[PDB]
Amino acid sequence: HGDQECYYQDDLRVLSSLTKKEHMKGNETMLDFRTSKFVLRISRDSYQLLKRHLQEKQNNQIWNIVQEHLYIDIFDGMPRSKQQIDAMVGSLAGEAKREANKSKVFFGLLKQDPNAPPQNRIPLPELKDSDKLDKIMNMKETTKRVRLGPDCLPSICFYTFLNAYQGLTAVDVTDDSSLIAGGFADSTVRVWSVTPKKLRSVKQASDLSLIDKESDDVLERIMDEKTASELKILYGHSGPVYGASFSPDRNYLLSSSEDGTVRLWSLQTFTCLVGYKGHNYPVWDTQFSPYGYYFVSGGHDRVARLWATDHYQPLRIFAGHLADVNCTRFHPNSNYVATGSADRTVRLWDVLNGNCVRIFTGHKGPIHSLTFSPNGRFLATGATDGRVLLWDIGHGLMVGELKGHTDTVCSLRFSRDGEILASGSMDNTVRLWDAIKAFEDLTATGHINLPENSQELLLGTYMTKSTPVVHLHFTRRNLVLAAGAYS
């Protein structure tokens, strides 16, 4: 155990405790490690030296262990440099095969784009007249949207939680910067209005029965003014609320917690509507679809479920990870779900057929943040090693590594144009990366040769006063919002 790599140190101390058989018969992570196959991507120039040392009968038993417990995925390339092999390894069942990263992925946006999926591929919901009224005032915000680039650096407005002696575990902001949710360790969700417009519930059923519909202003006549606060507390989780997700129509808050339930809170009645009990284990993340019907929740039981807000049971179970599904993110076309995890892999999952279409390995710690580019062509992932790895989706080969952060990168977001990727970590820093010069260049070998572009891609660091940057949000006029819970 001493002649192992330094990034396996937390993996070996779980093995030093395992000495008996019955200790391992109830671990369920080393039980799935013993039955699976390590993938072990090696080149054909090095596999010829390996097979000329194993096919002989002088060794004849370590060759039997290799061909029983290890897959070997061979690819043709020029040999990678030690600092290029270091960039793309670090995961159990590491460096997956290129035959997994060759499926056709519809990474384009919906409405021609040849990479775009059809509208009737995934049965997405209709666009209502109130939802069409939202996009009318959304493009008024896009009129004032600034082009950020490397010159016009954005202004960051930090929304710190001051007291927060119950530990803040989850933040979400609506797509228009109007609500901010807070998931806390005292089993509460707290919605704050940030615009000068108090949070109102709709009137009770006796008050709605006396008013008339039709009219012209029934989206204002139903809002109760007797209930109007700058803060609404939501009770009902029996555990710390780890995920928080708004719906794009600004109703329907989502929250997941340690008790194994995902909860759908209304934002018109400010009560709980549904409790989705599919996990028996802590659900570490949830997110609504960007069209607002489906939602994905990943938990401690090493799956991610796809729900639809209409069924008590899920529709898709994404069950290929070997550890906890820490993150679950939808694609901007919502045909693909990216699930980062604690076994140092990021996996894209097609919503049709539930198949894993991409496997992104190369992180050294559990992935704690994912985000997609607004193009849909790229994916930024962050983990506990302080590395932000930028992945292609049509190709799925990494090499672009942003390595400025020190501690766990817990929040990533691209700009509304895509000009800047913002990264927030436990180093109490909000780093800004040039997300245009990072993708400027973009196979038959599976890699593009690692450069060290991190210094060039930095635009600023922005140290925060003792406050870990839990969330990062981009206003539609390209203004960075961040929320932290000052410690």
Partner: protein, 120 residues
């Protein structure tokens, strides 16, 4: 203390640098609770076999009969992949266009008239 200084080395061997001072005190409280329920069951198993000395096979029996009930684990990978392919074969249902607030049947939701007592 003696047993409390070894507890700070079990955590430091697991890389736990920062911890509360009440963390050591209640892992010792769990370790004491775990050994006084192995050895309590060990002399129950020794009296079953009718021997006056609790020897090592009694503790081997009391460990593996307490680990068969107490310390469970998530579902296995061959069990998760069987219930996945049984579930992922069913095609996705279509959506009614104007059904309203899309919810499960009302016996699976938390939307009931939700009564309370009259104050008198």
């Amino acid at each position: 203390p003696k047993d409390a200084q070894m507890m700070a080395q079990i955590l430091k061997d697991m890389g736990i640098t920062e911890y509360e001072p009440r963390v050591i005190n209640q892992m010792l409280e769990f370790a004491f609770r775990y050994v006084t329920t192995i050895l309590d069951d060990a002399k129950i198993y020794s009296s079953h076999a009718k021997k006056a000395t609790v020897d090592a096979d009694d503790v081997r029996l009391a460990i593996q009969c307490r680990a068969d009930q107490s310390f469970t684990s998530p579902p296995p990978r061959d069990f998760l992949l069987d219930i996945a392919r049984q579930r992922n074969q069913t095609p996705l249902p279509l959506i009614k266009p104007y059904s309203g607030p899309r919810l499960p049947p009302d016996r699976y939701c938390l939307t009931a008239p939700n009564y309370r007592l009259k104050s008198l």
